[PDB]
Design a protein around this ligand. Sequence first.
Ligand SMILES: CC(C)CCC[C@@H](C)[C@H]1CC[C@H]2[C@@H]3CC=C4C[C@@H](OC(=O)CCC(=O)O)CC[C@]4(C)[C@H]3CC[C@]12C
Ligand SMILES: Oc1ccc(-c2onc(C(F)(F)F)c2-c2ccc(Cl)cc2)c(O)c1
Ligand SMILES: Oc1ccc(-c2onc(C(F)(F)F)c2-c2ccc(Cl)cc2)c(O)c1
Ligand SMILES: Oc1ccc(-c2onc(C(F)(F)F)c2-c2ccc(Cl)cc2)c(O)c1
Ligand SMILES: Oc1ccc(-c2onc(C(F)(F)F)c2-c2ccc(Cl)cc2)c(O)c1
Ligand SMILES: [Ca+2]
Ligand SMILES: [Mg+2]
Lengths: 279, 392
Amino acid sequence: GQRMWWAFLASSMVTFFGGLFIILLWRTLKYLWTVGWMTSVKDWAGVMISAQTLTGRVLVVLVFALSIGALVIYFIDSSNPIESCQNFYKDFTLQIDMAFNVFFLLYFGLRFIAANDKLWFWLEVNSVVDFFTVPPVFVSVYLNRSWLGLRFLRALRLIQFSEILQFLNILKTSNSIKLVNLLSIFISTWLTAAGFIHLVENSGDPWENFQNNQALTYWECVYLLMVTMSTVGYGDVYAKTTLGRLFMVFFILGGLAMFASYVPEIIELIGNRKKYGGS
Amino acid sequence: LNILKTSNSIKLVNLLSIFISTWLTAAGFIHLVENSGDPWENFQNNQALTYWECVYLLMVTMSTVGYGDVYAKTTLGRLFMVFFILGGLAMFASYVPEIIELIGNRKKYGGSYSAVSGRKHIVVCGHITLESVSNFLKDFLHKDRDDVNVEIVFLHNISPNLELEALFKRHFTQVEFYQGSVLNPHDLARVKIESADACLILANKYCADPDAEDASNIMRVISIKNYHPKIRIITQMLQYHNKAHLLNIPSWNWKEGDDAICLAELKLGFIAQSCLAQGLSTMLANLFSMRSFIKIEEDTWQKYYLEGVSNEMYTEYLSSAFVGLSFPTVCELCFVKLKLLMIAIEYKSANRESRILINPGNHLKIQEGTLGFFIASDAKEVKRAFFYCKAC
Ligand SMILES: CC(C)CCC[C@@H](C)[C@H]1CC[C@H]2[C@@H]3CC=C4C[C@@H](OC(=O)CCC(=O)O)CC[C@]4(C)[C@H]3CC[C@]12C
Ligand SMILES: Oc1ccc(-c2onc(C(F)(F)F)c2-c2ccc(Cl)cc2)c(O)c1
Ligand SMILES: Oc1ccc(-c2onc(C(F)(F)F)c2-c2ccc(Cl)cc2)c(O)c1
Ligand SMILES: Oc1ccc(-c2onc(C(F)(F)F)c2-c2ccc(Cl)cc2)c(O)c1
Ligand SMILES: Oc1ccc(-c2onc(C(F)(F)F)c2-c2ccc(Cl)cc2)c(O)c1
Ligand SMILES: [Ca+2]
Ligand SMILES: [Mg+2]
């Protein structure tokens, strides 16, 4: 049929923007026009969230695994065409994503219960990830026609690793925490930038009726981003469409500092080897 | 317009303005020179560009990236690039990190606490560091104690470092933090002292000059009292000589809901009271650390010692059935029918002054509603004191 790219983004936009509304209204819906069992539920969710008992421990480990699992599914989905159809009652993939997302929905709900202040929790880095990743799979199962767009965000989840390690009582030292946090930030930024370069370029910028496509597979974009960040430069791959160039300009504007700063520190923390240890 | 009063904001605005200005202007010059030709070739080597490509090329060049896509081709353009490099590189590499640093210096632990009905929250303030927090929290939340239902709230004016973040996160359901001070009567409004129950004060034991430490603690007590008179306070002190000043502040009530714990006094007191009999110091000092019973099988002294280490001291009201009896008799009854020991009785006079007696003799009999100290392994066992009739 005709292109249906517009519908998927919209379903998502509705949840995040719509949510801010209801939250603002409820705070402003008072008449003045300015132990409770609810609190027991709050405490139960809170203890379940982090390492407080066996059940919570397995939940955290399972999240740690399924995040990587979804990231793996994303790579397999890369080489497919931009927008086509996959019947839901026949295949095995697009079900593993379904099971992963139904799980992430409950893990998001539990977090939303056990938060002291709703508003700033709602606009938190980990949150918009789920907001922009959970709708499209359901909408796809509704329409039987999926779309690649805005699935690269599914790589951001790695930011959580530090936290979902500390509860497990595994990292209690300054150096280890510093190193893990830095590596997490770095890998996440790199992969997500690669993802964004892939969706805009493979598809045509809409200004000219989608006729400016330049072919590129996800690995190629990884290379373009690494060459640019380190200032090495090369002429092998240069993004051609307008949107790509604009994003490249802004990315270089801020983030080149990230590669000029983090890498020396990561190199310094590793390699502090005590050469004359032993017995 | 009286819109930028502070310091950092001026720096940030000035930098961003100069940067955007020079960037756009360089783009403009490249566009003008390149779209036009050159005089001494009679205008015959023009390269078709639009402003967008030019600004793209400048931002490619300044940040040392480089690319083989677009490059100025006429003499004037190349000369301009040759000169402009010398300034632009230093400009970019000395401005971008500054702008990144100035923005984003955001206090992560702002905000305020909230009050929840049906529970109780306390506050602490003072020498907050890894050792002290670990010890205090370990003793506070230990499982052997009676079922605990409280929350813990910290204050401090130094952002806690990474190592302590581990502890403050690991008890995600029982510990909360708020940066601020204690001398600023706005901060002490954030923590909601006006509905609290107490405010302990950790004091630095291993200080260099003792006097400054206790002076600061004194002023902390002064301020907390200033915000509210009816508060409870429990603090530390370092020499008996300065302890007295705290007696003076107007609302301390030693008779009701207040106290103070020194160190020097208790230190020398333990030593002296042990001078009459060896080891009494250890026997006392082990009664006030929460510990659990252990298994040891080797026939050393360690097993027989840990046998009694994990004992503790608790309090509970008596039973009505024991009023009309004899203190020796009730002691023997407690031990034989309970496997439980008691030391002293709380207070007996029908007067408005409260006095504490230890090991009463045989001229006293129990009145209705009397509290009594006990020593045993766990609080639940101590509670068996509620009633004993029809039990065998
Ligand atoms: C540098 C560190 C952070 C690791 C970087 C990882 C990437 C360099 C690798 C890891 C996983 C790889 C992917 C794993 C599997 C596939 C499927 C593979 O085959 C198919 O898509 C099957 C159909 C076809 O052949 O077109 C194509 C490459 C791709 C996306 C790979 C592209 C390169 C990836 C992203
Ligand atoms: O395969 C594709 C990819 C992007 C678009 C596309 O088209 N127009 C827009 C825009 F931005 F103008 F709204 C976008 C767009 C841009 C950025 C994001 Cl993050 C998501 C979508 C499309 O149509 C088909
Ligand atoms: O569209 C154009 C633009 C510039 C010239 C042009 O031609 N000759 C000269 C020069 F510099 F030699 F005097 C210049 C020139 C160069 C730099 C500046 Cl800032 C201003 C003018 C022209 O002829 C036509
Ligand atoms: O023919 C054109 C039209 C718009 C721009 C253009 O220029 N700047 C921006 C931006 F985004 F920075 F504001 C944009 C822009 C980007 C996306 C959309 Cl959807 C609409 C406009 C351009 O460069 C050339
Ligand atoms: O055929 C030629 C002639 C002059 C130069 C030339 O070389 N250097 C300069 C400079 F920059 F020092 F002035 C110039 C120059 C610049 C502007 C004007 Cl208007 C005239 C000459 C050249 O490179 C090649
Ligand atoms: Ca015990
Ligand atoms: Mg809480």
